[PDB]
Design a protein around this motif. Structure first.
Motif, PDB file in Angstrom:
ATOM      1  N   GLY A  82       0.744  -1.239   0.000  1.00 50.85           N
ATOM      2  CA  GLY A  82       0.000   0.000   0.000  1.00 50.85           C
ATOM      3  C   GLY A  82       0.778   1.295   0.000  1.00 50.85           C
ATOM      4  N   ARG A 101       1.279   3.600   2.359  1.00 49.02           N
ATOM      5  CA  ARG A 101       2.230   3.896   3.416  1.00 49.02           C
ATOM      6  C   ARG A 101       2.681   2.792   4.383  1.00 49.02           C
ATOM      7  NH1 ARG A 101       0.642   6.909   7.600  1.00 49.02           N
ATOM      8  NH2 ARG A 101      -1.574   6.692   8.143  1.00 49.02           N
ATOM      9  N   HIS A 110      -1.355  -6.259   0.369  1.00 50.27           N
ATOM     10  CA  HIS A 110      -1.830  -6.129   1.748  1.00 50.27           C
ATOM     11  C   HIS A 110      -3.365  -6.164   1.882  1.00 50.27           C
ATOM     12  CE1 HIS A 110      -2.658  -2.036   0.695  1.00 50.27           C
ATOM     13  NE2 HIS A 110      -2.786  -1.595   1.927  1.00 50.27           N
ATOM     14  N   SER A 161      -6.043  -1.296  -4.085  1.00 53.96           N
ATOM     15  CA  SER A 161      -5.150  -2.227  -4.737  1.00 53.96           C
ATOM     16  C   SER A 161      -5.942  -3.421  -5.248  1.00 53.96           C
ATOM     17  CB  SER A 161      -4.061  -2.710  -3.782  1.00 53.96           C
ATOM     18  OG  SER A 161      -3.181  -1.676  -3.467  1.00 53.96           O
TER      19      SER A 161
HETATM   20  O1  LIG Z   1       3.871   2.801  -4.436  1.00 51.98           O
HETATM   21  C1  LIG Z   1       2.672   2.886  -4.506  1.00 51.98           C
HETATM   22  C2  LIG Z   1       1.873   2.500  -3.438  1.00 51.98           C
HETATM   23  C3  LIG Z   1       0.500   2.585  -3.557  1.00 51.98           C
HETATM   24  N1  LIG Z   1      -0.013   3.013  -4.682  1.00 51.98           N
HETATM   25  C4  LIG Z   1      -1.438   3.169  -4.888  1.00 51.98           C
HETATM   26  O2  LIG Z   1      -2.020   3.678  -3.740  1.00 51.98           O
HETATM   27  C5  LIG Z   1      -3.242   3.069  -3.484  1.00 51.98           C
HETATM   28  C6  LIG Z   1      -3.231   2.303  -2.181  1.00 51.98           C
HETATM   29  O3  LIG Z   1      -4.504   2.236  -1.598  1.00 51.98           O
HETATM   30  P1  LIG Z   1      -5.048   0.984  -0.880  1.00 51.98           P
HETATM   31  O4  LIG Z   1      -6.402   1.055  -0.624  1.00 51.98           O
HETATM   32  O5  LIG Z   1      -4.706  -0.199  -1.507  1.00 51.98           O
HETATM   33  O6  LIG Z   1      -4.281   0.845   0.432  1.00 51.98           O
HETATM   34  P2  LIG Z   1      -3.681   1.890   1.456  1.00 51.98           P
HETATM   35  O7  LIG Z   1      -2.647   2.665   0.882  1.00 51.98           O
HETATM   36  O8  LIG Z   1      -4.869   2.761   1.801  1.00 51.98           O
HETATM   37  O9  LIG Z   1      -3.234   1.184   2.587  1.00 51.98           O
HETATM   38  C7  LIG Z   1      -3.621   2.287  -4.711  1.00 51.98           C
HETATM   39  O10 LIG Z   1      -4.459   3.097  -5.501  1.00 51.98           O
HETATM   40  C8  LIG Z   1      -2.282   1.969  -5.319  1.00 51.98           C
HETATM   41  O11 LIG Z   1      -2.318   1.713  -6.671  1.00 51.98           O
HETATM   42  C9  LIG Z   1       0.836   3.378  -5.713  1.00 51.98           C
HETATM   43  O12 LIG Z   1       0.379   3.750  -6.752  1.00 51.98           O
HETATM   44  N2  LIG Z   1       2.116   3.318  -5.598  1.00 51.98           N
END
Ligand SMILES: O=c1ccn([C@@H]2O[C@H](COP(=O)(O)OP(=O)(O)O)[C@@H](O)[C@H]2O)c(=O)[nH]1
Length: 457
Positions: A271, A273, A352, A357
């Motif tokens: 994700g 962060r 995750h 994602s």
């Molecule tokens: O290096 C990264 C990490 C995450 N994402 C993007 O960030 C989002 C992550 O959101 P998600 O709901 O999966 O999880 P979260 O970040 O909220 O834990 C998605 O759109 C991913 O494609 C990305 O583009 N690059």
């Protein structure tokens, strides 16, 4: 005439990304003018880059609406993360939305689920229809709607969460988001407050499709999850497609992917962060190396916006980097995940189970090795397994649980996912269903059309 829809995303890429995709779907797909209420500056560079890209790519239908926050003293939550601090400051600024709504001349307000309890009363006072964009699965939405009633039933005069039986499946106690066990936790207070207000809003938008979660969507639509039986309309608009941007340079990782054979690469990301402890990180790295597969691994720093390329050597050791040099791309930099997932060379996604994602994986038919860490991830992991989107080893531990998932377990799991023909086939079927849903006459398209209909009225 173009209906004007105002969007109010909360902080973080998990919230902004769905909002950005919705903005395009409404404007390009359904002829709406969309204003994104935006606080400047953003907590992170990724959000700022996303907004700048969105305003250029979706111009002029999608526009920036400046939202000025009331002064907030960060001393109230010493050591709190910047996203929570931005969220709390936004929550306290909810009365400032009323003048913004009048200036916007809004047809409707689409509020982030996390701001719904404060946004809805302000919208109600201004006579503006208030809709909620829920960022997770329909299963999570049903838990969110049901949880307050669940807590109320157990409230004897004079703590933690057990199995939650949502009327119309069971969320086992170990799959409940960890923060929900503590009633005083800030996440728990907002989760309950937002859940209680859901029944009072005009409608709820969810980034999912009816075929993906038939029981959860049916129960929400039937009002099974509330004491009164009343519930607002639920719009299944997913999976929302990535915004079409114009890059002017191809990224190195994309170039690296192009050099690999079709479906040969295991993409690993937890994700926007999530950062992992060195011991789990070591097992993950060793497992990946042991698998023998090519892999693209994105590692997140504990410090927001820090690209720690040297931390790779500190975190994993020079030897590991040296050994996997011919078959892996490992970075601490932000990557455009949506692009990576559309690439033909990717055969597996170790995720995750963050909802965005998962929606991206579902849209592109990419198999997912589910490795949930916290919050809604276990609930989402179950959906991945039942749907055939991917596989989930239930026994693998998550945050707060004792026991390391070893390199051997990881390697075996990766080898099996890559090895077995059915895994790709099942994931492809999910992609086909999602494609059907978002196409004209599909359930997701139908839901968006109905939502915009209500906005026109
Ligand atoms: O290096 C990264 C990490 C995450 N994402 C993007 O960030 C989002 C992550 O959101 P998600 O709901 O999966 O999880 P979260 O970040 O909220 O834990 C998605 O759109 C991913 O494609 C990305 O583009 N690059």
């Amino acid at each position: 005439a173009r209906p004007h829809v105002v969007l109010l995303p909360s902080a973080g890429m998990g919230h902004l990304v769905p909002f950005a995709r919705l903005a395009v779907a409404l404007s390009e797909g359904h002829g709406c003018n969309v204003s994104v209420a935006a606080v400047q500056p953003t907590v992170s560079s990724a959000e700022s880059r996303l907004l700048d890209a969105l305003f250029v790519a979706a111009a002029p239908a999608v526009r920036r609406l400046d939202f000025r926050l009331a002064p907030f003293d960060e001393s109230e939550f010493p050591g709190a993360d910047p996203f929570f601090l931005r969220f709390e400051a936004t929550r306290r600024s909810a009365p400032l939305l009323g003048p913004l709504l009048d200036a916007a001349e809004a047809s409707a307000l689409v509020t982030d689920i996390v701001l719904a309890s404060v946004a809805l009363p302000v919208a109600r006072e201004r006579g503006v229809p208030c809709y909620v964009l829920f960022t997770s699965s329909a299963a999570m939405l049903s838990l969110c709607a049901y949880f307050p009633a669940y807590l109320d039933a157990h409230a004897a005069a004079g703590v933690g969460v057990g199995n939650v039986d949502i009327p119309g499946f069971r969320i086992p106690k170990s799959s409940v988001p960890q923060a929900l066990h503590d009633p005083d936790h800030l996440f728990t207070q907002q989760f309950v407050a937002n859940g209680r207000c859901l029944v009072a809003c005009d409608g709820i938008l969810v980034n999912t499709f009816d075929a993906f979660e038939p029981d959860a969507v049916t129960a929400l639509r039937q009002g099974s999850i509330t004491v009164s039986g009343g519930f607002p309309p639920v719009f299944t608009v997913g999976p929302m497609l990535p915004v079409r941007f114009q890059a002017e340079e191809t990224a190195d990782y994309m170039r690296w992917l192009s050099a690999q054979p079709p479906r040969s690469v295991v993409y690993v990301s937890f994700g926007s962060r999530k950062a992992i402890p060195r011991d789990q990180l070591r097992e993950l790295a060793a497992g990946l190396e042991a698998s023998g597969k090519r892999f693209l691994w994105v590692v997140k720093s504990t410090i927001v916006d820090r690209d720690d390329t040297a931390d790779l050597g500190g975190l994993l050791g020079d030897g590991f980097l040296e050994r996997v040099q011919g078959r892996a791309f490992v970075t601490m930099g932000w990557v455009e995940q949506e692009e990576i997932l559309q690439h033909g060379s990717v055969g597996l996604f170790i995720s995750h189970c963050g909802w965005n994602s998962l929606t991206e994986a579902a849209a592109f038919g990419v198999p997912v090795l589910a490795w949930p860490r916290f919050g809604d991830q276990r609930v989402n992991a179950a959906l991945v397994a039942r749907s055939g989107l991917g596989a989930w080893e239930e026994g693998w531990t998550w945050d707060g649980e004792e026991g390391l998932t070893t390199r051997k377990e990881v390697a075996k799991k990766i080898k099996g996912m890559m090895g077995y023909d059915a895994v790709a086939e099942k994931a492809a079927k999910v992609g086909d269903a999602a494609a059907a849903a978002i196409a004209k006459c599909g359930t997701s398209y139908q839901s968006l059309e109905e939502f915009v209909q209500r906005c026109r009225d």
